[PDB]
Ligand binder design. Structure first.
Ligand SMILES: O=P(O)(O)OC[C@H]1O[C@H](n2cnc3ccccc32)[C@H](O)[C@@H]1O
Ligand SMILES: O=P(O)(O)OC[C@H]1O[C@H](n2cnc3ccccc32)[C@H](O)[C@@H]1O
Ligand SMILES: O=C(O)c1cccnc1
Ligand SMILES: O=C(O)c1cccnc1
Lengths: 346, 346
């Protein structure tokens, strides 16, 4: 794992410089395409992209797992829904499946800890049948977290060898906005009440209990903010760890990764804490309607492109933003040049 | 024209009700897909869509024209660029062409007043070789504005008969952010300094002159805020009128129209002033980087989906948002249902 984090490539400044120059000469007022231009330059700096903004095959990775903290009454969805919805993923009827199909991306459903019998068609990487209840102890051991990180990392970069150049991250697990909120509180240093949201339609009355649970998790486990792996293993979850692993894997592979919503933000905070070199490869998608979204994004210093008030998860937001990444590439490769039109602009 | 505005259909509440019920039963926590859900319901209410959110052929209409106010030094792009870039539109090398191609939409270039010889391949609807300089008088006569509105309206709804179900509006005309700013000031009641921007890279030093020009245009012409046609003809432009016409045409046709940037906002303010029934058919795309964008959007009571810091125009933002409209339809038609999975959620 040390090898992994060590071998994460830095961005290619040379390719980025040539990219900027090329974009500046396109048939348009310089800088008029704003963030679409900065996005194209960002992509060009990613080694896995061969010095130019391009998109080959696309894949969305959905990490599924159950959480012991569900027993604390922090989620209104039946715990069984995790397993049921995971199966639906293999049938292409879920929200991320439909949006991914629209973007021409393939969805990979990965079981990293569902509390049910194995589901046929789902990638098996389960650590255990659900993680421990973070309210009374750690979710898992440091060893289990590191092992999963390596496993998911390898799998992710392995897909790159199959033609995948753009990744999307997602999750599925009832009650996961609780550990997500806990990690955000720890990494950000914000009070629980400020980052705890309604998740999947949690009644407003039951909000106070969720906040108490998060505080208990932090007080009991005492996660060290300076150690991303410590935080993940103590008040995180298998699914959250998995998402972090996708981020580390793509970064090592020198490829871009599209974040999704609130759950992904917590995983990205952990990933950046573990390896700052991962940051240049992250691409925001939408602005989650979860209460702690603004705080989490501020600390990641990211400004989402899409404001859809979305809060479904599954990687649905990431899939929805893929067309935007492709647009930046289209702009870069298909637009004409000012010089060819004899047009001169300041 | 009175007939036109009179025959604009109201939204189909019955279809919208069935739409909401269907969306609520999809394989996801109720309301979790946020604005994507509200968008699907909006589409369902549009009569031209046959009671369901759907998208057939897509078209982006780019209205091109020159402005006399260019002589006041409010634009740094050579006046000839309007004609040159209009020709490039027919070659598919411009920004809107590339983004439209990515969305699978066809671009229609319409000349409503370019100050140059006719351009082959461009739809000819020119009123005159550029409009009058709004700083010393009106841009055109009320008659010319009404005639163009009718002509563009008919053309727009005529495309609907060819299979087009989703429209995008755009423009091309050096110095058009000046009359656009003037209209925004008048309709909104805001001071010129608050809504005048840099347009296509206007030097910061030259901003004061642009503001003075806008004030002069308003003082000299005395446009009546309560009369959208009066405002358009006095301190507007041929291109701006054309965009308004696309909005009225699609609304009459009961079809959705995607707005673009700042220029489109001014046209939408005029359209809504002329016929409030047009509002339900308008769909925002991105949030323009032009200074007066926030003010204009507030008065239209619209919240763009995309935050790309874009400021190119041409209808590039509208094309970029088309995939989002298609996603709402995909969600509506392709997602599975909770009942079929025996899943129950509050
Ligand atoms: O903390 P919570 O309140 O439980 O909210 C997080 C959960 O809701 C989302 N989620 C995504 N798809 C879903 C289908 C059914 C139910 C929930 C679903 C997340 O993917 C996760 O499963
Ligand atoms: O008021 P202004 O400062 O002139 O800014 C408005 C102009 O810039 C944009 N615009 C769009 N495509 C362009 C290509 C070359 C130059 C400008 C262009 C608008 O479409 C319009 O032509
Ligand atoms: O932002 C998300 O991804 C999210 C928010 C609430 C519930 N589930 C997912
Ligand atoms: O918002 C726009 O469409 C825009 C802003 C500046 C210059 N041209 C177009």
């Amino acid at each position: 794992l040390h090898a992994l984090l060590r071998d994460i490539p830095a961005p290619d400044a040379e390719a980025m410089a040539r990219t900027q120059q090329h974009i500046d000469g396109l048939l348009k007022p310089p800088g008029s395409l704003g963030r679409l231009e900065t996005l194209a330059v960002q992509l060009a700096g990613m080694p896995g992209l061969n010095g130019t903004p391009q998109v080959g095959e696309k894949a969305v990775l959905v990490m599924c797992a159950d959480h012991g903290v569900w027993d604390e009454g922090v989620a209104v969805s039946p715990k069984i829904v995790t397993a049921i919805q995971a199966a639906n993923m293999t049938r292409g009827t879920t929200g991320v499946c439909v949006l991914a199909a629209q973007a021409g991306a393939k969805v990979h459903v990965i079981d990293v800890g569902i509390d049910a019998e194995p589901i046929p068609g789902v990638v098996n990487m389960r650590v255990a049948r659900g993680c421990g209840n973070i309210a009374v102890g750690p979710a898992m051991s440091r060893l289990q977290a590191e092992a999963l990180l390596l496993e998911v990392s390898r799998y992710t970069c392995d897909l790159a060898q199959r033609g995948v150049t753009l990744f999307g991250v997602g999750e599925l697990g009832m009650a996961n906005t609780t550990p997500a909120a806990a990690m955000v509180s720890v990494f950000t240093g914000s009070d629980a009440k400020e980052v705890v949201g309604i998740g999947a339609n949690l009644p407003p009355s039951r909000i106070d209990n969720k906040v108490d649970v998060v505080r208990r998790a932090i007080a009991i486990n005492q996660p060290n903010p300076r150690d991303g792996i410590d935080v993940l293993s103590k008040v995180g979850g298998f699914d959250l760890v998995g998402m972090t692993g996708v981020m580390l894997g793509a970064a090592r592979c020198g490829l871009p990764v599209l974040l999704d919503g609130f759950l992904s933000y917590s995983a990205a905070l952990a990933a950046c804490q573990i390896a700052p070199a991962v940051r240049p490869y992250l691409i925001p998608s939408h602005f989650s309607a979860e209460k702690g979204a603004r705080i989490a994004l501020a600390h990641l210093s990211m400004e989402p492109y899409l404001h859809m008030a979305m809060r479904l998860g599954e990687g649905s937001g990431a899939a929805l933003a893929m067309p935007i990444v492709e647009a930046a590439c289209a702009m870069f490769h298909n637009m004409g040049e000012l010089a060819a039109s004899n047009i001169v602009l300041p």
